[PDB]
Amino acid sequence: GLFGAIAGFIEGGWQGMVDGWYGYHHSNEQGSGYAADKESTQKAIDGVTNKVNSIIDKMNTQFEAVGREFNNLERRIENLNKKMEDGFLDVWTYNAELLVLMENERTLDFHDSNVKNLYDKVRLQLRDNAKELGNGCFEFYHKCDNECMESVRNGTYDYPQY
Amino acid sequence: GLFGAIAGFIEGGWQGMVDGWYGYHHSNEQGSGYAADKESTQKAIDGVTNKVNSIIDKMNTQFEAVGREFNNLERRIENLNKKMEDGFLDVWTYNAELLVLMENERTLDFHDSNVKNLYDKVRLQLRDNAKELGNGCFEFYHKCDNECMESVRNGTYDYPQY
Amino acid sequence: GLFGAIAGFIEGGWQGMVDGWYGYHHSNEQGSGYAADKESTQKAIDGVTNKVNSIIDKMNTQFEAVGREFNNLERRIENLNKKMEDGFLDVWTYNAELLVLMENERTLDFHDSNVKNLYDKVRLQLRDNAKELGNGCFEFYHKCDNECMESVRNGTYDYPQY
Amino acid sequence: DQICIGYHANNSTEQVDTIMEKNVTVTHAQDILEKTHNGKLCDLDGVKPLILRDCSVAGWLLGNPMCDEFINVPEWSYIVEKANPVNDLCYPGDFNDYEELKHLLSRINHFEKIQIIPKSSWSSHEASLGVSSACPYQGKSSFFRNVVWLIKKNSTYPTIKRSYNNTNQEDLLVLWGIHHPNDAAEQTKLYRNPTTYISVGTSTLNQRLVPRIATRSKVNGQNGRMEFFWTILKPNDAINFESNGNFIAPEYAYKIVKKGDSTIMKSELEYGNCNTKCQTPMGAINSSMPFHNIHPLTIGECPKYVKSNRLVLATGLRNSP
Amino acid sequence: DQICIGYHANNSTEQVDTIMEKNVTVTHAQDILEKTHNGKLCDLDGVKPLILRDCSVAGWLLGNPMCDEFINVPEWSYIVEKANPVNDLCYPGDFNDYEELKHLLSRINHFEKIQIIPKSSWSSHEASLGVSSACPYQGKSSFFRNVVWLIKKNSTYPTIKRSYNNTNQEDLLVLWGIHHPNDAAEQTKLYRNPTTYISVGTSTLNQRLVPRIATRSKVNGQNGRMEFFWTILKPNDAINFESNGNFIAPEYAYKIVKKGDSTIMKSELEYGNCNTKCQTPMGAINSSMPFHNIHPLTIGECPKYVKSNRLVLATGLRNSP
Amino acid sequence: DQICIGYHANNSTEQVDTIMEKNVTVTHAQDILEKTHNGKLCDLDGVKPLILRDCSVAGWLLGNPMCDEFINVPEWSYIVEKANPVNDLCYPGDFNDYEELKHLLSRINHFEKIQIIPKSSWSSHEASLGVSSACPYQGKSSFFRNVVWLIKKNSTYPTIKRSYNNTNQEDLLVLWGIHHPNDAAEQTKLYRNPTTYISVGTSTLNQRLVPRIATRSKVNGQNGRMEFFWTILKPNDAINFESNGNFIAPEYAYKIVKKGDSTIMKSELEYGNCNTKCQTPMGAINSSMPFHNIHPLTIGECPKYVKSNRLVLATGLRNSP
Ligand SMILES: *[C@@H]1O[C@H](CO)[C@@H](O[C@@H]2O[C@H](CO)[C@@H](O[C@H]3O[C@H](CO[C@H]4O[C@H](CO)[C@@H](O)[C@H](O)[C@@H]4O)[C@@H](O)[C@H](O[C@@H]4O[C@H](CO)[C@@H](O)[C@H](O)[C@@H]4O)[C@@H]3O)[C@H](O)[C@H]2NC(C)=O)[C@H](O)[C@H]1NC(C)=O
Ligand SMILES: *[C@@H]1O[C@H](CO)[C@@H](O[C@@H]2O[C@H](CO)[C@@H](O[C@H]3O[C@H](CO[C@H]4O[C@H](CO)[C@@H](O)[C@H](O)[C@@H]4O)[C@@H](O)[C@H](O[C@@H]4O[C@H](CO)[C@@H](O)[C@H](O)[C@@H]4O)[C@@H]3O)[C@H](O)[C@H]2NC(C)=O)[C@H](O)[C@H]1NC(C)=O
Ligand SMILES: *[C@@H]1O[C@H](CO)[C@@H](O[C@@H]2O[C@H](CO)[C@@H](O[C@H]3O[C@H](CO[C@H]4O[C@H](CO)[C@@H](O)[C@H](O)[C@@H]4O)[C@@H](O)[C@H](O[C@@H]4O[C@H](CO)[C@@H](O)[C@H](O)[C@@H]4O)[C@@H]3O)[C@H](O)[C@H]2NC(C)=O)[C@H](O)[C@H]1NC(C)=O
Ligand SMILES: *[C@H]1O[C@H](CO)[C@@H](O[C@@H]2O[C@H](CO)[C@@H](O[C@@H]3O[C@H](CO)[C@@H](O)[C@H](O)[C@@H]3O)[C@H](O)[C@H]2NC(C)=O)[C@H](O)[C@H]1NC(C)=O
Ligand SMILES: *[C@H]1O[C@H](CO)[C@@H](O[C@@H]2O[C@H](CO)[C@@H](O[C@@H]3O[C@H](CO)[C@@H](O)[C@H](O)[C@@H]3O)[C@H](O)[C@H]2NC(C)=O)[C@H](O)[C@H]1NC(C)=O
Ligand SMILES: *[C@H]1O[C@H](CO)[C@@H](O[C@@H]2O[C@H](CO)[C@@H](O[C@@H]3O[C@H](CO)[C@@H](O)[C@H](O)[C@@H]3O)[C@H](O)[C@H]2NC(C)=O)[C@H](O)[C@H]1NC(C)=O
Ligand SMILES: *[C@@H]1O[C@H](CO)[C@@H](O[C@@H]2O[C@H](CO)[C@@H](O)[C@H](O)[C@H]2NC(C)=O)[C@H](O)[C@H]1NC(C)=O
Ligand SMILES: *[C@@H]1O[C@H](CO)[C@@H](O[C@@H]2O[C@H](CO)[C@@H](O)[C@H](O)[C@H]2NC(C)=O)[C@H](O)[C@H]1NC(C)=O
Ligand SMILES: *[C@@H]1O[C@H](CO)[C@@H](O[C@@H]2O[C@H](CO)[C@@H](O)[C@H](O)[C@H]2NC(C)=O)[C@H](O)[C@H]1NC(C)=O
Ligand SMILES: *[C@@H]1O[C@H](CO)[C@@H](O)[C@H](O)[C@H]1NC(C)=O
Ligand SMILES: *[C@@H]1O[C@H](CO)[C@@H](O)[C@H](O)[C@H]1NC(C)=O
Ligand SMILES: *[C@@H]1O[C@H](CO)[C@@H](O)[C@H](O)[C@H]1NC(C)=O
Ligand SMILES: *[C@@H]1O[C@H](CO)[C@@H](O)[C@H](O)[C@H]1NC(C)=O
Ligand SMILES: *[C@@H]1O[C@H](CO)[C@@H](O)[C@H](O)[C@H]1NC(C)=O
Ligand SMILES: *[C@@H]1O[C@H](CO)[C@@H](O)[C@H](O)[C@H]1NC(C)=O
């Protein structure tokens, strides 16, 4: 993707993380596990929901055909009528298909961006106190227990203390 | 936004910076203040201007209706005429509304990108000689007077000297 | 561009690199030269190819006019017919021109992104063992011979060893 | 001790297309195109359609005797005619401005039939021998039930001068016709007078039909032809008939009681005993999807027709193997 | 000592919509939709429109005596007719191919009226008693001013054989009519001859009108009807009239001096004494916006009509609280 | 010792436009708009078009004697008529429903001409003096070759009663006409009978033409007029002609052997001796581009017409100085 995170420097997703779209995994002496980041996940949910409703809304005022009969000596205007109805259906078909293609691209990139930004939020907290592993992970120089870990998810990780 | 800067790791904008869209704030013993980055600001201005004129230009060759009368026994072709004129207005209305929605998204992201890129331009200069605070700011290890600061805005910040 | 690499922190492209779209240049005691990154280049090629064929495909089901004669007292329906054919050609002309404009923007950004991501792939490997010069380049602290260099292009650069 | 950033994955096989890549597996997706229907013709908001079955709109309005099922039809939501209904004009001929009339019915939900010129009231002309073997009913010769084929009485066709006045509140659909016999002998036999006419007048209408007498091919065994005409009689306006032969007179006309949304749908289907909020010529649609790809001509609260086979939005992210 | 990167903020409350979010406050925005007009009918580049007021296009061209205001109108930019003008055809009847003629006027900016058949030149027929109480002027009976209702002179209607030749450089709009009396007695009273005709010929035209005599409803107290016809007479071509009764002859015709851009606009408004470069049926537009949402039918250098209530582009960036 | 990331550059001057910037030089680009044609009218998949040259479609079908080149034309891919062909209706007149007929030819690739009423078979009427100086052939007076101008034989025009039956498998295009003489004397000279008619009947058709006799302008030195009519005769159906004068009878008719894709193209060009898979009125297109901007009306396997001057996709990246 454009932002380099999803299927980039983070090779793959987590079957183990079930309660959100993005989040953290920790490993320490007490154990390991996953934690969804509720803020960025909820932002994602709202974005994608609004997008869908936006698409559905734009398209609901759109051409609708009606039947018109013509006789054997009104072929020109019958043909005019056929080419006019087909003309608009092609236009709307094109519009729908393209919108979906384009907005799918943007949706996938949006997710990539949210992950990249979450990775950066944490990197900017840890600074020199953790080794950046190159794969989405951060190895701490100090021992970091469950409360230390929560503080990193908090945003309230006291860098100077460590 | 996609690039993580605007209303991201930079929480908010500056009422104090009036002479540009992006720029610097400095704080040292001599005092503090704002300085617009003229290059990236001017790039932004040109981009957005071209975009607007591009939009206005695309839309100026577009369907325009004309009146046609029909009598009491030409209802089919009258209806054909009504559905044809309305058909195109819906198409153009959809085009206009969508273009604006889409291009607004891109415009906001463009600004986010310019800020992110400016932040990186400075980060790449300072390197190990400043602490990256995590909020758009850089705290220097050496004392950095007004001429030092200007050199950072210059692009000509002598890293080795410090 | 949006991602800051192309004509950003990397000032310009390389006439010298002929066998790919993105890649590496190395300089050491044994000499210097260019090496295309085949993975990211091939990804770029596939993306752009699919895009083109996608564009060509969307547009091939589209309005096509046919001749219809009308006499001196069928002017209204003749005019209806002219305005209907012109109406659709304007719509398709607009669609084609816009799609190209929009997709050109995205194509240029795509390339910018691939370069930025390649730069990051290498940065994340080197870590503290090289100085990040600020211009696309990495100066090593250790001496780095041709096999060392290949290992950086490999992805298999043993950080701990150095 | 370490902490990692990451993203969701699951067992989803749902795919979406993009401009640069096709068949990208994602964790979540939303189909927005309706591809299924029930295959039936249904009531539209509980209001049953008029299903003409084997009758055409002309056979229904004129009263083709094989179309007695539609002698008094209630209000309808839409009308369903076949592509080539067998029971059209039993007696061969034409229907003037037929397509402009059908277009009028797309805006009509209800007719009330009323008698404007009683059959009994033709005292100087014979009004019960106007019957043809081309229009049979229960084995006997009959004719269009809403019009009267007047022929000479005791070898005389005195000039007809009749007039109906639209006193009732509605607009009225009045229908009549002219007979085009095969030859001069048939003309004299039926109407005596060699040369004849029918003049019809309203506030707007001012016509004068003359029979064209020519040799024709038999159709349902008839050399003659009937040309049918119509007009809408505005309220408080009167229609004037003058004729000396060949006149197919109205007995019944239709009050237009309900205007609004309707359509004439072409379909070989019959009634399905269902209800629905959206109907197509090949079946009804029950869905909240923004789009469908079943058929362009719909009636009701419908999704938007597109010609796609597939429209699927990504909601989730790229799913990893 | 520290340095920070940042971006502009201000007191702007301007909002723009995006696909993923609505009502995003931005520092700067550009409205591109024009929503206001002046509410007036205006000159178009200093060229005043033809405002028919209570006259219809037919009442104007035929010379309905209540339409003397338009006896000689200058060049116009556009024409403004009402939806239901009262002064149409004072004497009831029809206007053949009326809508095809109106369509011709959308391409016409100026007429010069000229006399083709002098009223005085009818020496074998009476040309001053062709007047009706249905077409009153200053209390007296009158008639359409551009045509002549010829009636018998001393109980004779000799066959009329007249011919005008388009010597002048322009195309010429010629108008004429036929009278459809109520009955045979009225026919004989006015024209003597029981059965009549009017034949009209040009290089392309070859018609033969016959009066249809029928009982009709009164409209403005008239049982008769007038059917009006027209043709464009090409330069250097001649029109041939032959008739033995019922003929409504042309006195005046219209030279087509200016072609170009024009339109027939439907509006209940009157003249506003303004100038503008863009006019709609509900008012004029003065703006440099690419779009407007006032009305679809415009004339001039106009923005593009869309049906939106709001179109606002972001220029600035997301404004922070 | 250092390593650098970077990207391609080259000597390309190709430019593409974007929304935010115009004329961006890129390393690679793909033109997708075809701007060139060969300037010729060509065969379409080896099937030569019917190039009427100076003949109009009417002059071809009726058999204008100046149109002998098209006396028996093979199957065509498309038809090419000029804007104002000189050889139309040598004898002035009209062609009823002409445009509806042309529309029929857009779906026709081949006619086979056949004789339905032999010229020799007119034994009670004169069928060889129906010739005019307005329709000359090799200096002598002639006439439309596919129809017969019947005139009186030994000062008698007995009523004509003829009938053709479509036994052959195809649909048949039958053409006929009526003569509108200048005056009563010309009428009596040619046909004796003062008042005449032509009645034509099929299963669907039931008409009765009467000549309108009026003074007209000369066109190619003729005061008379010919009105031509047509119909499609379904297989196994018969057409009945009855007339007592003024009848322009059919000798030849056209079997419709091939339906399908065709068009009537307006162009002043002539045959170019080329082949192509896509043809326009100004030349043929040989390209694999998705779009072209040459002309809207194409026939064949064509790119899509747009009105642009330029459509170029970026493939490569921004090229640096
Ligand atoms: C089909 O039949 C109907 C019903 O018969 C015809 O409608 C009627 O036609 C008559 C004329 O034949 C009209 O005029 C008479 O009645 C009016 C009524 O005036 C007022 O009062 C009634 C209530 O009774 C009200 O409905 C009306 O709206 C109106 O306000 C009389 O005024 C009129 O006599 C006039 O008196 C005026 C004042 O003294 C004079 O100025 C006039 O010159 C005139 O002398 C006359 O007696 C009816 O109004 C009308 N009725 C209805 C219910 O519509 C219809 O015309 C017919 N169609 C055709 C084509 O023939
Ligand atoms: C309505 O009225 C107008 C005006 O009267 C009619 O137009 C005129 O019609 C006459 C025939 O009735 C035409 O023919 C005569 O004049 C031509 C003129 O030829 C040249 O010279 C004039 C200048 O005087 C110029 O304008 C022309 O363009 C042209 O170059 C004579 O040649 C012609 O006589 C011919 O001589 C030829 C050579 O000897 C012969 O080959 C011919 O066989 C023939 O004998 C004749 O005298 C006028 O040309 C024409 N005038 C104008 C100004 O248009 C119009 O026809 C009428 N309409 C209807 C429907 O009747
Ligand atoms: C133009 O000319 C053609 C050719 O002459 C006309 O078509 C023919 O018209 C006649 C009537 O004039 C038709 O009816 C006769 O033939 C049928 C044939 O029936 C079957 O057998 C033939 C094979 O020979 C087959 O092609 C048919 O498809 C069919 O299966 C006779 O049945 C019919 O007599 C009937 O017998 C029935 C059984 O006893 C009775 O129920 C009927 O009441 C009736 O007595 C009669 O002899 C031809 O069928 C028809 N031929 C063809 C090849 O189309 C055409 O009508 C004419 N057009 C016009 C407008 O006049
Ligand atoms: C996010 O997480 C950090 C680390 O888990 C939170 O800090 C801890 O917060 C708890 C909850 O109140 C504190 O509990 C308090 O402990 C003191 C003494 O130990 C006791 O006197 C109080 O009654 C109370 O139970 C805990 O001390 C504190 N510890 C550390 C090391 O930070 C933090 O509150 C969270 N912040 C946010 C914004 O979510
Ligand atoms: C951007 O800013 C830096 C730092 O402010 C600039 O460096 C300074 O530039 C000034 C302007 O010329 C120099 O002034 C010179 O000073 C010397 C001796 O002090 C004097 O002999 C000259 O006559 C002149 O006045 C100043 O020395 C210099 N100082 C430092 C520490 O850099 C730089 O020029 C700017 N560069 C760009 C690209 O904008
Ligand atoms: C990418 O490049 C690195 C560095 O060039 C590769 O490592 C080198 O790979 C070669 C190829 O097999 C090794 O060759 C072997 O050498 C040993 C002893 O020197 C010999 O016994 C074997 O027969 C063989 O020739 C080489 O040792 C090795 N050296 C180093 C310092 O890494 C690596 O294989 C490449 N990896 C990928 C994924 O492309
Ligand atoms: C993307 O996947 C679709 C759906 O699986 C593929 O289309 C199907 O291909 C299979 C196997 O070749 C066929 O049996 C089906 O008939 C196809 N179904 C449909 C609806 O098209 C498609 O080939 C894939 N596209 C690409 C570009 O890889
Ligand atoms: C976005 O803001 C608009 C404009 O303020 C909102 O629409 C208005 O809502 C107010 C308060 O509910 C109403 O009184 C007005 O009638 C609305 N005006 C218009 C022009 O719509 C809108 O509700 C907001 N939309 C969203 C999605 O939050
Ligand atoms: C982008 O480049 C195009 C093509 O070179 C420019 O258009 C040409 O401008 C030259 C020099 O002014 C003219 O002589 C040509 O007539 C133009 N050709 C075409 C096809 O337009 C254009 O001016 C440039 N556009 C911008 C915005 O800089
Ligand atoms: C996929 O996973 C879900 C668990 O959330 C499970 O319920 C479902 O049965 C699985 N589906 C398939 C096809 O394996
Ligand atoms: C439509 O079908 C859905 C099945 O998803 C059902 O829940 C609903 O009740 C149906 N409604 C009607 C009116 O048939
Ligand atoms: C917003 O700020 C500007 C200062 O640039 C000031 O002039 C203006 O009055 C302010 N507007 C409001 C509504 O406060
Ligand atoms: C249009 O209105 C603007 C107000 O912004 C004014 O400046 C301009 O002069 C007006 N022009 C005309 C022709 O009315
Ligand atoms: C550009 O470079 C290529 C080398 O790949 C060369 O073959 C070509 O001639 C050059 N074109 C121009 C115009 O200099
Ligand atoms: C079309 O032109 C191309 C030139 O690029 C040529 O290779 C090809 O053979 C041509 N085909 C035809 C059918 O003319």
UniProtKB/TrEMBL annotation, chains D, E, F:
Single GO term (MF): host cell surface receptor binding
Keyword field contains Disulfide bond: yes
Cysteine pairs bridged by disulfides in the record: 42-274, 55-67, 90-135, 278-302
Any GO BP annotation: fusion of virus membrane with host plasma membrane
Keywords annotated in UniProt: Clathrin- and caveolin-independent endocytosis of virus by host, Clathrin-mediated endocytosis of virus by host, Coiled coil, Disulfide bond, Fusion of virus membrane with host endosomal membrane, Fusion of virus membrane with host membrane, Glycoprotein, Hemagglutinin, Host cell membrane, Host membrane, Host-virus interaction, Lipoprotein, Membrane, Palmitate, Transmembrane, Transmembrane helix, Viral attachment to host cell, Viral envelope protein, Viral penetration into host cytoplasm, Virion, Virus endocytosis by host, Virus entry into host cell
Cited function: Binds to sialic acid-containing receptors on the cell surface, bringing about the attachment of the virus particle to the cell. This attachment induces virion internalization of about two third of the virus particles through clathrin-dependent endocytosis and about one third through a clathrin- and caveolin-independent pathway. Plays a major role in the determination of host range restriction and virulence. Class I viral fusion protein.
The protein's name in its UniProt record: Hemagglutinin
Organism from which the protein derives: Influenza A virus
